[PDB]
Every structure is written in C-alpha cells, then in structure tokens.
Write a protein that binds this DNA or RNA. Structure first.
Ligand code: TTP
Ligand code: MG
Ligand code: MG
Length: 342
DNA sequence: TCTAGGGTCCTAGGACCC
DNA sequence: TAGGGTCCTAGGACCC
C-alpha cells in the first residue's frame, strides 16, 4: 500500500526566468529583490550570487555587502505566472493528482499512473526533461512514498537533478535527518527542539508521544509522526485561495496620518483589481488593515464586512493609527480581505 | 545588514448558544 | 447548572 509521490521544484525560479529572457544575466550574480533604498529583501538569486552567500529573505543591504556587483532586478510576475501555468499543464499530461504549493512547485501523486511503466523515477525525469525542452528552464524533483520526504528529496540533487527514496531507504534516511529539514519546523521550533537535546528524527524517535503532545500540542504529534516517516497527507488538487492582501513598505518611515492615508489611496485600487479577478462583485467575508512600526511590531485589525470598501479601510487604519502606535514611525501599510468560504 | 510581499495554518480568550 | 459547543478576532510561526 505504498504511494508514489513526486515533488517538482523549479531551480532558482524567478532568476532562472530572467536569465532565459536576458542571457546577459546568465553568468553574473543577479537577484530579484527590492533596492537597499527601498529597504528590500532578496526574493531569490542565481548561482553566481549564491556563491557569495546571497540567499532568499536576506536584506538587500546584506546581499550587496556580500556581493557588491549584485545585479538587482524588480521581478516580472506575469512572466513567472506564465511559466507556472505551463509546467502545471505539463504535470497534467501525467496525472490529474496535482497539488501546487506555489508558482514554481507541486506534489504529484503518480501511484495510479500508466506512464513510464509505473516508474515514478522515470516520470519525474520525463517531466524535468519536458519542462526544459518547452520552457528552457530546469527543475529538480524528489520521489518518495509520502509528501514531506519527496519535498526533502527534491532539494538534494538541485539544480537540475532528482533523488528517489524507497521505503527500504526511509529508516536510514530518517536516522540522521535534521528536524529543521522537515517542512513546518522553522528556526524558532528547531531552536526549542535543540534546547531539549532534539536535533534529528533519530532523536525524536527516542521520544514519548505523550511528552511531545504536552510540550508542543498538535505540532508535537506531527513531529513524532514525521520522525518515523509517517505522513498520511493526501495530494489534494482542490485547494482554493482564502485571502487577498496588498501591503507596501515605504523607503522612509511615516509619522503623519496624512501620509498613511495617501498610501492607502494607492493600495486600494490594486486590492480591488486583484479581488475583482476572482470575485467580480467584490463580495467578501472580512476586510482589514495592517500597520508595521519602527520597532518591527505589527498589528492587524479586520472585521466582518460584506463588500470591499475603501472608506471603511481608511477609517479602520485611522483607529489603529491613533490607538496603537505611540509616536513610532510606521514602515508598512497593508490592506487585507478574507474571501467568502465556498 | 537591517530586515518584502504573496500567502497558509494554528492557537487562544471571550462572546454567544444550550 | 456547570459545563459543553462554535464564531470572532489578533498574533505569530512558517512557507514560497
Ligand atoms: C523562499 C522564497 C522564495 N521566493 C520566490 C522566489 C523564488 O524563485 C520562488 C520559488 O521559491 P523556492 O523554490 O523556495 O526558491 P528558488 O526556486 O528560487 O530556489 P531553488 O532552486 O532552491 O528551489 O519563490 C520569495 O519571493 N521569497 C522567499 O523567501
Ligand atoms: Mg524552487
Ligand atoms: Mg519552490
């Protein structure tokens, strides 16, 4: 009763698209991210920049100290979305069991697949080859019996490569697998896990479920399961977006409500335009605002509201600005909408 | 170096219902 | 009849 799960993951996705579309960027360090003056971070970088230590989520001022010649790009999100549509149509030639996780990646359940003699290894190879032939972009893949192992496996032969984990190989693979490599175990959890002497799935195997349940709640059960290779999550091809958000970080902090209002006036049309693509009548469940301060504390207030409304968002931002802000500079204003359920 | 913007999921207290 | 459900809401870890 073993499933065959493929995780497919595009290599340096945004940057790979910019190199295809402008070959002059192929061999110099490049990154998509906001400028240092715009107070940006790196979205992603190519391998020449990664050589200097440039990473996703790194503040752009840090990226340039590490890599002074870094060529900074703004991002062409329609070009990326077009590549995403194409690779997802390529996935559909092999199975309809496709769960996209983002523009550039998806789980595939190929258990019931007729292609390539039921070899998930060969299906993954053929998808990567087709992606390259039709889009001139490379992808990596991971093949495993469950989601999270397949997703770990796609990172291990990057770029332009794959890795297969059989059920026979799972116990040896788990024994030394760092917990931080498990999707959903981030910095905060890994440091809390490290402080009680838990670093690897091997360590957690030597643990009692009851203790993990008391110390981490439902997260403790997931830790216990993952450390054994247990991941029963099904590939779900029916997920739908639940929210729409539009926010901006200013080059300089703002200190006057007139400035905040001015920002919202620019944000609102963008939010209405993106909402209208999915809900033309603009009917919603909740709408709300977000402020982020000088000191990086962040607050949101949102409420039941039936239809996108600019003045109510302005009013809500006014309350949050007056009430909870105490003469701090504001670095970010955001608008937010929660979509109706169905 | 100085910290984005797109999101998902979980948690928790009080309101509210019974 | 002392407590059991289920929304509302804010915050925060985490993902790409
Ligand atoms: C991780 C991350 C990705 N992204 C964007 C840019 C990435 O190219 C795109 C896909 O994310 P990832 O697949 O996580 O990163 P990647 O494709 O650039 O690198 P890799 O070759 O290691 O898979 O999502 C961000 O904007 N911010 C982030 O923090
Ligand atoms: Mg990728
Ligand atoms: Mg990815």
């Amino acid at each position: 009763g073993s499933r065959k799960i493929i995780h497919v993951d595009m290599d340096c996705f945004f940057a790979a698209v910019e190199m295809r579309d402008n070959p002059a960027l192929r061999d110099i360090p490049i990154a998509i991210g906001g400028s240092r003056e715009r107070r940006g971070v790196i979205s992603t970088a190519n391998y020449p920049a990664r050589k200097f230590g440039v990473r996703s989520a790194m503040p752009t001022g840090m990226a340039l100290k590490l890599c002074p010649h870094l060529t900074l790009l703004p991002g062409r999100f329609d070009a990326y979305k077009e590549a995403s549509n194409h690779i997802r149509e390529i996935f559909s030639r092999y199975t309809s069991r496709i769960e996209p996780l983002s523009l550039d990646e998806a789980y595939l359940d190929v258990t019931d697949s007729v292609h390539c003699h039921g070899s998930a290894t060969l299906i993954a190879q053929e998808i990567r080859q087709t992606i390259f032939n039709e889009l001139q972009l490379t992808a990596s893949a991971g093949v495993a019996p469950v989601k999270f192992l397949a997703k770990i496996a796609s990172d291990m032969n990057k770029p332009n490569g794959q890795f297969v984990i059989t059920p026979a190989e799972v116990p040896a693979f788990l024994q030394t697998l760092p917990l931080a490599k498990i999707p959903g175990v981030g910095k905060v959890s890994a440091a809390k896990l490290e402080a009680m002497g838990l670093r690897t799935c091997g360590d957690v195997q030597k643990c009692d479920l009851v203790m993990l349940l008391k110390r981490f709640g439902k997260f403790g059960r997931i830790l216990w399961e993952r450390s054994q290779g247990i991941d029963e999550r099904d590939v779900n091809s029916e997920r739908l977006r639940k929210s729409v958000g539009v926010e901006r970080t200013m080059a300089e902090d703002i200190h006057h409500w007139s400035e905040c209002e001015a920002i919202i006036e620019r944000l609102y049309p963008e939010l209405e335009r993106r909402l209208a693509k999915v809900k033309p009548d603009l009917l919603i469940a909740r709408q709300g605002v977000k402020l982020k301060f000088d000191d990086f504390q962040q607050t949101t207030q949102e409420h039941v509201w039936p239809r996108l409304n600019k003045a109510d968002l302005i009013a809500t931002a006014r309350k949050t600005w007056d009430e909870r802000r105490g003469g701090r500079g504001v670095r970010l204003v955001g608008l937010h909408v929660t979509l109706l359920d169905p």
